[PDB]
């Protein structure tokens, strides 16, 4: 499956002018477009090389739609201040995420259209693409307005229609990078610790896409509570890194195996120091 997602943020700054409005677009784990109201000549912009093939209409049209969205979020931020009886002096953040997950037969699998205010869920379109879930009182005001207005039907048209068709087309045009798989290159490092035991760290490097499973076992039993992991992190060149470690008794390192599962491996890897 693949996804096309847009991540939108508006942050007010009383005393320092109009709120900052930003959009970032992703295909799976790759950012390909961005807009930033603080930039000079604010314009929807390429952030992947495969998208720069699109003609000036694509960019004109996306700069129009971002600038229209920006005005809507300016009004939404002040509406929030009335809903929650907040002073106009403080800074607040409104976030929006919309996009589609498609199986690789071009068939939609889930649409998203959801919002958050000052870091908490506000309203989200449910997976039937017809009804809303409202987090609080204020969001229920928005729910009833969006129910009366038929908002879901219009937003569902985007998720079922142009989000699937443009995804499918971004995947074709960016095939070389988007439908690449890079297997992890894995190895185990050994470190003696100052009170007698050993850290074994299982590394997975240069992999794409980001999803991966890294586990340690002792004599074939998984060490689910003992393992330490780091959040998966970008290498900065389009691939990712991750590691998992365990603390083991000195002289017993060879009883432990690290196991790596990833789309780029035909079979999971088992590694042993």
């Amino acid at each position: 499956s693949h996804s096309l997602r847009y991540f939108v943020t508006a942050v007010s700054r009383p005393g320092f002018g109009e709120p900052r409005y930003m959009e970032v677009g992703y295909v799976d784990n790759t950012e390909f477009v961005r807009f930033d109201s603080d930039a000079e000549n604010p314009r929807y912009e390429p952030r992947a090389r495969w998208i720069e093939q699109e003609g000036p209409e694509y960019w004109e049209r996306e700069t129009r739609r971002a600038k229209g969205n920006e005005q809507s979020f300016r009004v939404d931020l002040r509406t929030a201040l009335r809903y929650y009886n907040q002073s106009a002096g403080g800074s607040h953040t409104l976030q929006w995420m919309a996009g589609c997950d498609v199986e690789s037969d071009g068939r939609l699998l889930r649409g998203y259209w959801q919002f958050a205010y000052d870091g908490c869920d506000y309203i989200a379109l449910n997976e039937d693409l017809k009804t809303w879930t409202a987090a609080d009182m204020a969001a229920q005001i928005t729910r009833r307005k969006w129910e009366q207005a038929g908002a879901a039907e219009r937003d569902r048209a985007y998720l079922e229609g142009e989000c699937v068709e443009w995804l499918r087309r971004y995947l074709k045009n960016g095939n070389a990078t988007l439908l690449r798989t890079d297997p992890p290159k894995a190895h185990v490092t050994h470190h003696r610790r100052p009170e007698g035991d050993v850290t074994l760290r299982c590394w997975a490097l240069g992999f794409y896409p980001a999803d991966i499973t890294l586990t340690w076992q002792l004599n074939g039993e998984e060490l689910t509570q003992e393992m330490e992991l780091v959040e998966t992190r970008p290498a900065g060149d389009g691939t990712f890194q991750k590691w998992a470690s365990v603390v083991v008794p000195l002289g017993k390192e060879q009883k432990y195996t690290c196991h790596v599962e990833h789309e780029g491996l035909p079979e999971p890897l088992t590694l042993r120091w």
């Binding site: 847009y6 509406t79 996009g99 908002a151």
Partner: peptide, 9 residues
């Protein structure tokens, strides 16, 4: 292509 906002909160 990206989503457009049509209704205010």
């Amino acid at each position: 292509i990206g989503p457009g906002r049509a209704f205010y909160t």
